[PDB]
Design a protein around this ligand. Structure first.
Ligand SMILES: Nc1ncnc2c1ncn2[C@@H]1O[C@H](COP(=O)(O)OP(=O)(O)O)[C@@H](O)[C@H]1O
Ligand SMILES: Nc1ncnc2c1ncn2[C@@H]1O[C@H](COP(=O)(O)OP(=O)(O)O)[C@@H](O)[C@H]1O
Ligand SMILES: Nc1ncnc2c1ncn2[C@@H]1O[C@H](COP(=O)(O)OS(=O)(=O)O)[C@@H](O)[C@H]1O
Ligand SMILES: Nc1ncnc2c1ncn2[C@@H]1O[C@H](COP(=O)(O)OS(=O)(=O)O)[C@@H](O)[C@H]1O
Lengths: 173, 173
């Protein structure tokens, strides 16, 4: 097989990481490209069921995710990782795990304003955080460090379909 | 893709787990069957780099490995897991993670006697353990519970090639 590669999505909760990732996955699969979405949230329920949201656990979650991505990539998949990845050092770690495994690594920043993300508020998490029912929530009372150099920055200027198509164009260029 | 399955190898250090697993991988791949080895020792240098050989770390190591296997299996691979898995409960846990994920799970016991494993001694570890330079070494001063009912027991009667073929025959029946 060709060895695979990893697309790592960072951004606020509700910024479109999973949507874009899922759509990219379908588009690729429809053209016989074996793509797989390795979702921070889903893994948190099995492999990463023992971790929370302290910066240390998130780093651990993400460290683990980064390894699993390189493993799926080594099996020949195009891996899509939507995960908040709130700190530069989180992304720097993932990148280094990929460098060390000799797997191509692309960073995509889903740069949707906080306003838009909670105007969306799809799982009700912003509301809970503003109410004090969740704490250390990214963008509210836990920081989000903006990537300075992503491979691609997505903005809420276009449809999810078209955002997926930009990810694909990044991969095919 | 149809869903993959897992072959889980248990046995003493130097009993042939990795050798058989690698050879099974190659044989399968040469026939256009997508196979992948998750080797305990290799992954201890990345995903599981944070774990040692306390019984607790070994359980965690093997818990993690079991989740990764099911996930690669779900992607359609035939997953080969050589790892000592020294306790019955370790194997029972992996089996359950697989049952729960609806992935077929086969247990292979590489039943080479301690004496033979020591007499092989490929990485010098038994010697270090006898000398007191390593502690909690499986079979010397850390236990190995022998599987009561593996799907396949491999014995030092055959070449590694032939042992691989038996694993394959097990899968193809
Ligand atoms: N470019 C876009 N245009 C319109 N709506 C979007 C866009 N990106 C995301 N959305 C909507 O906003 C929400 C983003 O949620 P999701 O992708 O789950 O965010 P995340 O995975 O980053 O937490 C979704 O309901 C999606 O429908
Ligand atoms: N059936 C066999 N016949 C001959 N040699 C074997 C057989 N099984 C294993 N070996 C040898 O014994 C050693 C087992 O090593 P390995 O597969 O690394 O064990 P483990 O992964 O179980 O530690 C290897 O050096 C291999 O050369
Ligand atoms: N305190 C929190 N901050 C951000 N997300 C949270 C928090 N608590 C729960 N979550 C949930 O966990 C998901 C984020 O998971 P990841 O992307 O795996 O997080 S990350 O920070 O470690 O990268 C969010 O989509 C949200 O659904
Ligand atoms: N104390 C030890 N006990 C057993 N194996 C060890 C030990 N220290 C280092 N090793 C090396 O680590 C490998 C064992 O790793 P695992 O298969 O991952 O162990 S397991 O118990 O957690 O299943 C061995 O093949 C050997 O190379």
């Amino acid at each position: 097989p060709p060895r695979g590669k990893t697309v790592w999505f960072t951004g606020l909760s509700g910024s479109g990481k999973s949507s874009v990732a899922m759509l990219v996955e379908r588009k690729l699969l429809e053209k016989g490209i074996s793509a797989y979405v390795l979702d921070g949230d889903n893994l948190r329920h099995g492999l990463n069921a023992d971790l929370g949201f302290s910066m240390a656990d998130r780093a651990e979650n993400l460290r683990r995710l980064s390894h699993v991505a390189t493993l799926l990539a080594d099996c020949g998949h195009l891996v899509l990782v939507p995960a908040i990845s709130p700190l530069a050092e989180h992304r720097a770690l993932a990148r280094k795990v990929h460098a060390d495994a000799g797997i191509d690594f692309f960073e995509v920043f889903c740069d949707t304003p906080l306003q838009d993300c909670e105007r969306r508020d799809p799982k009700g998490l912003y509301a809970k955080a503003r109410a004090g029912e969740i704490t250390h929530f990214t963008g509210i009372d836990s920081p989000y460090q903006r990537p300075k150099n992503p491979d691609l920055r997505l903005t809420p200027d276009r449809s999810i379909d078209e955002q997926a198509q930009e990810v694909i164009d990044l991969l095919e260029s």
